[PDB]
Design an enzyme around this catalytic site. Structure first.
Site, PDB file in Angstrom:
ATOM      1  N   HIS A 113       0.698  -1.366  -4.272  1.00 53.70           N
ATOM      2  CA  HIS A 113       0.993  -0.977  -5.677  1.00 53.70           C
ATOM      3  C   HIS A 113       0.905   0.540  -5.867  1.00 53.70           C
ATOM      4  O   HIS A 113       0.147   1.229  -5.135  1.00 53.70           O
ATOM      5  CB  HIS A 113      -0.033  -1.622  -6.576  1.00 53.70           C
ATOM      6  CG  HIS A 113       0.335  -1.682  -8.016  1.00 53.70           C
ATOM      7  ND1 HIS A 113       1.624  -1.836  -8.467  1.00 53.70           N
ATOM      8  CD2 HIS A 113      -0.447  -1.680  -9.128  1.00 53.70           C
ATOM      9  CE1 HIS A 113       1.629  -1.894  -9.793  1.00 53.70           C
ATOM     10  NE2 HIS A 113       0.390  -1.751 -10.226  1.00 53.70           N
ATOM     11  N   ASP A 130      -1.066   1.120 -15.296  1.00 53.87           N
ATOM     12  CA  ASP A 130      -0.802   0.022 -14.308  1.00 53.87           C
ATOM     13  C   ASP A 130       0.204  -1.022 -14.864  1.00 53.87           C
ATOM     14  O   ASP A 130      -0.135  -1.775 -15.812  1.00 53.87           O
ATOM     15  CB  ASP A 130      -2.107  -0.672 -13.956  1.00 53.87           C
ATOM     16  CG  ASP A 130      -1.953  -1.784 -12.902  1.00 53.87           C
ATOM     17  OD1 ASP A 130      -0.810  -2.003 -12.369  1.00 53.87           O
ATOM     18  OD2 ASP A 130      -3.066  -2.360 -12.605  1.00 53.87           O
ATOM     19  N   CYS A 183       7.454  -0.877  -9.122  1.00 58.06           N
ATOM     20  CA  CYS A 183       6.216  -0.323  -9.671  1.00 58.06           C
ATOM     21  C   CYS A 183       6.278   1.214  -9.644  1.00 58.06           C
ATOM     22  O   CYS A 183       5.830   1.811 -10.567  1.00 58.06           O
ATOM     23  CB  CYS A 183       4.926  -0.859  -9.013  1.00 58.06           C
ATOM     24  SG  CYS A 183       4.670  -0.353  -7.352  1.00 58.06           S
TER      25      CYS A 183
HETATM   26  C1  LIG Z   1       5.302  -1.488  -6.232  1.00 57.90           C
HETATM   27  N1  LIG Z   1       5.937  -2.583  -6.552  1.00 57.90           N
HETATM   28  C2  LIG Z   1       5.222  -1.090  -4.777  1.00 57.90           C
HETATM   29  N2  LIG Z   1       4.300  -0.161  -4.408  1.00 57.90           N
HETATM   30  C3  LIG Z   1       4.147   0.223  -3.125  1.00 57.90           C
HETATM   31  C4  LIG Z   1       4.969  -0.323  -2.131  1.00 57.90           C
HETATM   32  C5  LIG Z   1       4.781   0.129  -0.684  1.00 57.90           C
HETATM   33  O1  LIG Z   1       3.887   0.952  -0.474  1.00 57.90           O
HETATM   34  N3  LIG Z   1       5.529  -0.353   0.342  1.00 57.90           N
HETATM   35  C6  LIG Z   1       5.340   0.058   1.730  1.00 57.90           C
HETATM   36  C7  LIG Z   1       5.651   1.506   1.991  1.00 57.90           C
HETATM   37  C8  LIG Z   1       6.988   1.944   2.001  1.00 57.90           C
HETATM   38  C9  LIG Z   1       7.266   3.301   2.247  1.00 57.90           C
HETATM   39  C10 LIG Z   1       6.215   4.208   2.478  1.00 57.90           C
HETATM   40  C11 LIG Z   1       4.883   3.759   2.464  1.00 57.90           C
HETATM   41  C12 LIG Z   1       4.598   2.405   2.224  1.00 57.90           C
HETATM   42  C13 LIG Z   1       5.921  -1.291  -2.554  1.00 57.90           C
HETATM   43  N4  LIG Z   1       6.031  -1.655  -3.855  1.00 57.90           N
END
Ligand SMILES: *C(=N)c1ncc(C(=O)NCc2ccccc2)cn1
EC number: 3.4.22.-
Length: 239
Positions: A113, A130, A183
């Protein structure tokens, strides 16, 4: 509404700065966490204080900004947009980062998140947004922790007249109900409403329908992707 990762969020903050220069476009890589966001903010506000007295900064230079430009940002900024990367499982900053790195390679959200803490220096307001409403802890607990933090900030960054930092919990219901990807975008959207109007109750005005509200959010995302297409990559705007 696809997933907004840290790079796109940073860009969008860069763009946001060129519209509202009192926003410093704080780097999202590596991001703040629930373990170090306090320390990070305190360190930024102390560096701002040093800059106001013409002294050296102590804290770390951003990767994508010169020393000289970072001084001007610190001098001009009235608004810290702190993006907080959360996952329920890791129990230290270092674990949080390891989980973050891991979830990138698996290329899913998982349970991860983004949260936004706006440090509004002018209004003296901590704003916790949030889109999941209570993913980290209940809003009331988070309010209480932030009222504590807000008192440290009265000591660290005092006002001319001892006006105390106040705390608002932005979301009163789950904002991103029928989406698990939105998010980052929500966080940038909420930010943008807040810049347009810090007295916003844009969240209260949202359509009840989850589809409608994510259609609007999708438009928002398209408008921003169009708006940053030509802006430099990995490069702070010049303050
Ligand atoms: C919100 N819905 C949301 N927040 C964070 C992610 C996430 O961190 N996904 C993995 C990731 C991708 C690229 C770089 C670092 C981490 C997804 N969705």
């Amino acid at each position: 509404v696809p997933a907004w990762d840290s790079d796109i969020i940073f860009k969008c903050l860069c763009y946001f700065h060129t519209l509202y220069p009192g926003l410093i476009p704080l780097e999202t890589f590596p991001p703040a966490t629930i373990f170090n966001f306090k320390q990070k903010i305190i360190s930024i506000l102390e560096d701002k204080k040093a800059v106001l007295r013409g002294e050296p900064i102590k804290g770390p230079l951003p990767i994508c900004c010169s020393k000289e430009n970072y001084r001007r940002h610190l001098q001009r900024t009235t608004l810290l947009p702190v993006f907080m990367w959360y996952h329920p499982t890791p129990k230290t900053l270092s674990d949080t980062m390891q989980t973050m790195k891991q979830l990138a390679i698996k290329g899913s959200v998982g349970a991860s998140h983004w949260l936004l803490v706006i440090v509004d220096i002018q209004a003296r307001r901590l704003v916790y947004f949030d889109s999941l409403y209570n993913y980290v802890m209940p809003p009331e607990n988070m309010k209480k922790e932030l009222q504590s933090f807000a008192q440290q900030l009265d000591q660290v960054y005092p006002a001319y007249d001892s006006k105390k930092f106040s705390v608002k919990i932005a979301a009163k219901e789950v904002i991103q109900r029928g989406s698990g990807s939105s998010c980052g975008a929500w966080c940038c959207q909420f930010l943008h409403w807040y810049l347009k109007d810090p007295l916003t109750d844009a969240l209260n005005d949202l359509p009840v329908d989850s589809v409608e509200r994510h259609e609007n959010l999708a438009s928002f995302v398209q408008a921003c992707e169009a708006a940053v297409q030509d802006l430099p990559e990995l490069s702070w705007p010049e303050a």
